[PDB]
Structure 1
């Protein structure tokens, strides 16, 4: 008279299938990308242009000597 099945206490667990979490898609991407990339080239032309100014100063000390 000592046998298994309980009178109660059950679930069940699902048979389902779901993890579609979105996700920042669909014109949200391709907009943060271009907005990041244009910040890069804007951070250029303030350094590459400025280094060309110091470049001419480096040639300047050459030319003020050599006679």
Structure 2
């Protein structure tokens, strides 16, 4: 017998495609969810700032009543 290195009856194929998934969101959906979380942060920001101004006015009234 002979003992070279042949391929055994043929081998499987190997791909040659530029395999790209291009996944992720679109323009509109990513854009809208970013602006939506932005507006959520704005609303909570507005609420905290106006309640904070209430308390800071109370601090002003403390210094007024303390002064003379």
Shift of 1:9: 4.8
Measure, in 1, the Cα distance between the counterparts of 2:55 and 2:7.
86
1:10 matched residue in structure 2: 11
Taking structure 1 as the reference length, the TM-score comes to 0.85
Q: How far has the Cα of 1:64 moved from its partner?
A: 1.0
Number of residues of Structure 1 aligned to a counterpart in Structure 2: 67
In the alignment, the residues of structure 2 paired with residue 25 and residue 66 of structure 1 have an alpha-carbon distance, to the nearest angstrom, of 61
Alpha-carbon offset, residue 22 of structure 1: 2.3
Give the Cα–Cα distance (whole angstroms) in 2 for the partners of residues 46 and 52 of structure 1: 10
CA RMSD after TM alignment: 1.4
The 2-side partners of 1:6 and 1:19 are apart by: 31
**1:28 Cα offset (Å):** 1.0
TM-score of the aligned structures, taking structure 2 as reference length: 0.84
5+ unaligned residues in a row in structure 2: which ranges? none
Greater helix share, structure number: 2
Moved more, 40-49 or 17-26: 17-26
